């Protein structure tokens, strides 16, 4: 019914499947799909870069990125809530026998630069050998200062250090900036583009940068399984979310945004609106309640002391109002 | 347009597609989606297994299936020739930490118990940990002897040791053997699927075993890289094919040998004889300039001295018929 | 001939060289040597442990401690600047495919439970999976409060997490506690224990931990390299050590308190006074010309803003009392 | 007593531990220790190589030399009996991330480079990277042909591929051959030394090579905890040992050789006589009973179908003589 868990719940529209169904096709690992090629042709050209690759997963996008970039041995400095740090099962670790070096990311967003340089390691067998910095460009909904993507750009140049940023929802700080992507994609040697949330694909990711880069990339792609086949039928739907579900973001921004005052005007605690993302404070008693009084009348959230409502195209304002007289009510 | 390169090429049938259109989907991380866990159920219910699940590649579904399977430092018993240890990059000991102790085939493409038994690994520190034994039916065509499959299940069985057979086209062998998939399903722990070879799906691949096993393979598979959101599309196509496209494998296997006789006559060296599968020996550069000779004619093949020629539903007699009269030609 | 660079430089004392070349050996890769053995069993009894185990590092002791804790996947928590997260090039998770879980220690040199707490990950497939809590023991000189450690014990067990400790300096906060060995080391499932520092030995550390741990901490250490022959000779010295040489460690921790006043006196910014460390802060480059008017002196130091000036066995007081006027001197 | 299980049993003589207890050291992570620079100066110039490195034990040395050879990924094709294949715990592929390729060894102990040939990967994203052939000269016993060690050489120069020898027991070979080190090592860009063995120290390896390539090796003696401090205590006996038991290794030989008469001459089935190694074919049914009527004289064998009897500094002819008589009245 309303979703308001995650924006991954986003479904195709049919002028999407039908896009999907009419998508020529060809063997992936040969390199023969058209639509898979033309996908990651526009990618890459869109973002000023020179290759790109599509992946089953954002989360495996960032392992292949991570093993790309990081050889056994080095590390990867990273945010203490990053995905590719947290929720991605320590896989840069665990799977490809990468050090990772985390740190707190400041209110904003972004990781301190001060605080990133005092975790590069000195070139000393005692330490693993630092060589990549990874963001995340909407963090928690949160965008990204475009001063500090130049900056931290700068820095790693200065350092000899990738850059390499995780922008499952990159469109959303790009219509959040109002430039276009290439003037922020300029600032990274490589980041992943997720098309299964705002933009509302049903699977896939991207992942673009060098074409030496996604060379290797490819090698790791097929050793971690998603060399995939004629897996153009997916990529068509990237490409109709390129080209029809970007400017609409704004949709789902503004939204979150009108949410935030009615559930303010409701007696709901807002604690922080970004992009399509709102956390109210609904505390430890009223949290289980929540979920229960909400589910009921098919409203799905997360329940938890802070609650994270997130927007997408298949969620109205008429359905965000009737979730606010909900909230009203459970008062 | 005509492909013997592999039965990967197979692409969509007009059925197919619309049972992919007219399907149900949802957020499979959250297990939402009705036909990911429909095909996931019946593919188990087929093979008298408790849990079936879903994936990108056979390639992960191997991968998946031997973390779940071996512990860091554990190791596992298969053919030189294996997929799981030649064709995927070696990612069981790259990704998982697993040490492989692969041997030759027999020529049924059986792994000799007796070789088996000798690599075995005392419980001595100086060695790796025997735990599984992993077989490949349907190995390069060649259908396994029921008996022995009942061979090995006793044998490891005997010495503690987990069996896993990759089945990327274990329904060549089930059409092959004249029995139903569970009678041979019955002598293996876990097994793979791959819906996108001979039972034309695009893309997708199943792990089935126990319940327990197969909640390992989870975790693995969101690490690897594969817990994708809307699958229910993919999933549509993969419980089409189960239903409709494996008893037609008769007539793949029928074409290879019906072509067996074709390039015979024609005057071609065929050496071997199985399945959906056809192999020409052709001799050095003599092939290489054969794949021009049919590239040119729009025959796609895998030129090598020993060409392997693999037939599926997205190729017929009469172009069959039409790859044996180009083929005798230069000749 | 005045090393104040660490306490891992100390020599052999005539009476441990004797000890050693005295000392009767074997192939410990079958356990046949007796000395090594009688170590083992003495740093096992001492501590109140079933068993311990001899390596060549203390390098190695951590990595296999941490092998032998947590399984492939799993995590362990650890200090930001703890040796086994940041002084050994990341081995857990390089080798070992440990994710690792670093947070910063507060200014007494633990780990702030309720930092600790909010780390442990959610049994979700997105997570690690939280399985130890590494202390460590002399941090930098500084001792755990004995309160805490007690306090860590029971936070573990209630969150069913193992505890090990980084014992490189166990002894000098046994010394500082003024307390026995097993009364500390009953807060931990287990610890390791260096006897190349402060205790004088040239070579090698023990892990002490249940019987079955240490089973598995053999195959680690022999996989990791560390199965040694005729390690009696090297066992010799530490049972040497560990009888004549802890009570002695009060002798250094005087002198470092006699040195902090000293360069104090002089002029110098004495920053932290603890054990037998000692931390003096520089100043940027008239600390790398400090290490250049020591060095003309055969004063050996580690040249840094912060300098950090470490006593033992092999640094008397005359010694230090030249290094203070040495000291005084070029300010 | 009388051990004729392994030459890892040798004994430090009382020339040798004098030597060990007269050696000047240093902490050898500050590359300071005198004896152990100077043992790995003399290494690397004897075998006409440019830097050396001493590790605590051959495993680690072939672990590190692995690691130092192959990057995340890559493989090395070795020897299916072969010592870093078989007998190191699986450690270059558990803890390596290495791709482990085994040949079966040709009945002299070499690796058929046709069968070599067929093993190397083609540079496609399905197989591992090929980049590594690791020998083992003395292989059980076995000398490797000088023409096969040249063939070896050449072949992987045209191939691009390194080739590195597992040197446990090289000097025996060498002594073997009557020529010099150099003229064999320089057959290879890498090797390892074993000082433990007939050599008889009571620790101790060595690995030699390029100078960037030990540079990399001390990165990962570090991490997998080879790093020692005043190991030129042990360095030291190593010195003394290729300066004083290089050449008695031919007595060992002619013993072996003695005793494989008079156990032919006693009864016994003599299958194979190479350097320090005789192989006596016991039977299913006389083996444990001969171990235990062995080890009643204080006669210590490895009991088995197939006995391997290895001698030693350690073990004079009279003793042979002694256990001979004891192997005919066994009947
Ligand atoms: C996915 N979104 C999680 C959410 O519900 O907020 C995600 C990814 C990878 O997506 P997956 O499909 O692999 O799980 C990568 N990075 C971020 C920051 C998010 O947020
Ligand atoms: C050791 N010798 C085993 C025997 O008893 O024959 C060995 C090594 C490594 O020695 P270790 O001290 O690390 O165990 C490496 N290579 C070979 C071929 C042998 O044989
Ligand atoms: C094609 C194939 C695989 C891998 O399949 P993908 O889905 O392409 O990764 C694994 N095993 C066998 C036996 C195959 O034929
Ligand atoms: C010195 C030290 C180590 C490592 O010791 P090595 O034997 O040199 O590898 C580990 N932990 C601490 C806290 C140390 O001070
Ligand atoms: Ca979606
Ligand atoms: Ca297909
Ligand atoms: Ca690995
Ligand atoms: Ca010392
Ligand atoms: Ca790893
Ligand atoms: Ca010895």
Not at 119 to 146: C, M, Q, W, Y
Not at 177 to 205: H, M, N
Not at 259 to 279: H, K
Request: glycine share 8%; charged share 25%.
């Amino acid at each position: 019914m309303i979703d308001l868990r995650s924006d991954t719940v986003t479904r195709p529209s049919r002028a999407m499947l039908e896009a999907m169904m009419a998508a020529p096709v060809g063997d992936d690992v040969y390199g023969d799909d058209p639509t898979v090629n033309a996908l990651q042709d526009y990618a890459a050209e869109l973002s000023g870069k020179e290759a790109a690759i599509f992946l089953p997963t954002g989360t495996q996008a960032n392992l292949v990125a991570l093993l790309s970039h990081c050889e056994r041995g080095e590390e990867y400095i990273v945010g203490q809530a990053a995905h590719n740090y947290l929720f991605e099962a320590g896989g840069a670790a665990v799977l490809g026998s990468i050090q990772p070096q985390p740190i707190d990311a400041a209110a904003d967003g972004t990781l301190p630069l001060d605080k990133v340089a005092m975790k590069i390691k000195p070139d000393d067998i005692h330490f693993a050998r630092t060589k990549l910095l990874s963001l995340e460009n909407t963090h928690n909904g949160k965008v990204l200062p475009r001063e500090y993507l130049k900056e931290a750009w700068e820095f790693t140049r200065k350092r000899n250090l990738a850059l390499h940023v995780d922008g499952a929802r990159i469109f959303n700080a790009v219509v959040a900036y109002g430039c276009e992507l290439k003037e922020i994609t300029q600032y990274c040697d490589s980041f992943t583009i997720c098309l299964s949330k705002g933009l509302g694909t049903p699977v896939g990711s991207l992942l673009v940068g060098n074409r030496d880069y996604i060379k290797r990339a490819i090698r790791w792609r097929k050793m971690t399984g998603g060399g995939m086949r004629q897996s153009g039928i997916l990529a068509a739907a990237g490409m109709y979310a390129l080209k029809n579900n970007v400017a609409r973001l704004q949709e789902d921004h503004d939204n979150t945004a009108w949410m935030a005052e009615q559930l303010r005007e409701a007696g709901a605690d807002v604690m922080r609106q970004d992009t399509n993302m709102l956390f109210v404070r609904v505390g430890e008693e009223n949290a289980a309640a929540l979920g229960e009084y909400m589910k009921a009348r098919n409203v799905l959230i997360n329940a938890s002391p802070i609650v994270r409502l997130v927007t997408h195209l298949d969620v109205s304002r008429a359905q965000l109002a009737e979730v606010a007289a909900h909230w009203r009510a459970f008062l």
